[PDB]
Design a protein around this ligand. Structure first.
Ligand code: XPV
Length: 188
């Protein structure tokens, strides 16, 4: 067949009841994740190929970067809670991987301040129990699939994207193939 279990995707052996339809995991420490966001724009190209209004969910992970990796999962929970993901994704990736100016939780906060989130608003969110619940949710979703690498994308708790089965000689063709595979899976 054109799409085959074990080629463009693999099938979870213990599927996850009630999972987000389209669930992406990343780390701001992850070099391929930087490529996925800043160079390939995977999440945006996937969204443009799914029906209007569908739920794409994107969660950060703890297992890269030690202490700061866990701070970034909490900061990502702040970003989700305040709805400022689009304002802080680029400066966080660049601050960790390009300029290497993010070295502490305070440096992460500066990214939000510079992006126009008020200090009191950031700190209140950082310390909130709503943000604790969002951290818990990110952790649980990664645990549900025994996640040990990023970037990763899951469709309906059932299918995991397998980009290692895709020609990457042309960036645009690769992104298309990835997006079309998500569409195909979501229609399964
Ligand atoms: O898990 C793996 O190693 C496979 C994989 C995950 O994300 C990728 C991105 C590219 C890429 C291609 C062109 C430009 C920039 C990045 C290539 C391969 C992979």
């Amino acid at each position: 067949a054109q799409y085959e279990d074990g080629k463009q995707y693999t099938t979870l052996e213990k599927p996850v009841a009630g999972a987000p339809q389209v669930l992406e995991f990343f780390s701001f420490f992850c070099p391929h994740c930087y490529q996925f966001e800043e160079v390939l724009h995977i999440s945006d190209n996937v969204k443009k190929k799914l029906p209007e209004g569908v739920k794409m969910t994107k969660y950060h992970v703890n297992f890269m970067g030690g202490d700061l990796g866990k701070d970034l999962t909490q900061a990502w929970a702040v970003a989700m809670a305040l709805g400022v993901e689009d304002k802080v994704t680029v400066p966080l990736f660049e601050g960790v991987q390009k300029t290497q100016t993010i070295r502490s939780a305070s440096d992460i906060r500066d990214v939000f301040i510079n992006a126009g989130i008020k200090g009191e608003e950031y700190d209140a969110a950082w310390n909130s129990f709503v943000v604790k619940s969002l951290v818990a949710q990110q952790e649980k979703a990664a645990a549900d699939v025994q996640l040990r690498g990023v970037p990763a994308m899951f469709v309906n708790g059932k299918y995991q994207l397998n980009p290692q089965g895709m020609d990457t000689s042309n960036m645009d063709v690769f992104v298309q193939q990835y997006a079309d595979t998500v569409k195909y899976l979501s229609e399964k």
